[PDB]
């Protein structure tokens, strides 16, 4: 009688809208939106400094995880910061795009798992000791990185 | 393991893949298009007149009529995509007002009312007019905003 998607679309929009206007409880919506915005800003800066992120990405089914682990380990080789965490998400997204482009779509959920695992095991402890996701929202919410960039040009 | 870590990753990847053009269910595409269309509508309204939530007024007992009253007024002449977007924004405005007046219990009710109206009175028109797929093609990639900024 009722399409479930009609519920899901409404809940998504209202979550997006209420968080946008400043209200928060779990801050799930705020963190997701801040990550979306931060990822876009990172990729904008990367692409305007070098070539696109997905431009050079070599992946095969047999070495996908191995390559992922090496890149991420070198990224956080000497430490974690909010910028590198954003870069982490952007790299994973870039890895997924290249996987689909090379007709290895099945690797998408795998990359998603590897990211969640690394985020959980190696990034979460740092995040907790640095103010939690709450701090990330305060610093990067409302497209703060983008606003900073060209309060400067 | 935290499931939030899974949820955060899945959301980002869905956003990114859909943004770069890939689609299957187009769930992510529709959600993002609605977020963008909603923002654009509210921007245009706020410049033309006052903000949307500024003039709203409700109580738990008078919340429902004030909803159906406005909504049926919005769609009496018929249905188009612009009005459907306005329907979402009004619902959002109603929730903002409710929270501001500390009637947060109304939020999930307003959400239910929207879903019900969307399902009963808007979905038939949507399916006959190309489905959400047409909405994505027309309003995706912040199209309404790009049309305005061109002038």
């Amino acid at each position: 009688h009722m399409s479930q998607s009609n519920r899901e679309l409404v809940v998504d929009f209202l979550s997006y809208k209420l968080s946008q206007k400043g209200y928060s409880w779990s801050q799930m919506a705020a963190v997701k939106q801040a990550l979306r915005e931060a990822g876009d800003e990172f990729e904008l800066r990367y692409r305007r400094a070098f070539s696109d992120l997905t431009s050079q990405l070599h992946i095969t089914p047999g070495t996908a995880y191995q390559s992922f682990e090496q890149v991420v380990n070198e990224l956080f080789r000497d430490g974690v910061n909010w910028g590198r965490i954003v870069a982490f998400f952007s790299f994973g997204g870039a890895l997924c795009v290249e996987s689909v482009d090379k007709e290895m779509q099945v690797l998408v959920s795998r990359i998603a798992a590897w990211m969640a695992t690394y985020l959980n095991d190696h990034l979460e402890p740092w995040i907790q000791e640095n103010g939690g996701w709450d701090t990330f929202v305060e610093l990067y919410g409302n497209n703060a990185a983008a606003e900073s960039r060209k309060g400067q040009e | 393991m935290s499931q939030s870590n899974r949820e955060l990753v899945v959301d980002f990847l869905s956003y990114k893949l859909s943004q770069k053009g890939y689609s299957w269910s187009q769930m992510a595409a529709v959600k993002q298009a609605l977020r963008e269309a909603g923002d654009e509508f509210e921007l245009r309204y706020r410049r033309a007149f006052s903000d949307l939530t500024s003039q709203l007024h409700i109580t738990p007992g008078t919340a429902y009529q004030s909803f159906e009253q406005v909504v049926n007024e919005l769609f009496r002449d018929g249905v188009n995509w612009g009005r459907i977007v306005a329907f979402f924004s009004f619902g959002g405005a109603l929730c903002v007002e409710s929270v501001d007046k500390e009637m947060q219990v109304l939020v999930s009710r307003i959400a239910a009312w929207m879903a019900t109206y969307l399902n009963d009175h808007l979905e038939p028109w949507i399916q006959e007019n190309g489905g959400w797929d047409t909405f994505v093609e027309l309003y995706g990639n912040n199209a309404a905003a790009e049309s305005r900024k061109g002038q």
Partner: peptide, 20 residues
């Protein structure tokens, strides 16, 4: 801003944020 005051229990928060 906080959507709910410190008085709210998680039960009523669920009622206000979740459908049905």
């Amino acid at each position: 801003d906080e959507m709910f005051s410190d008085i709210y229990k998680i039960r009523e928060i669920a009622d206000g944020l979740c459908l049905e």
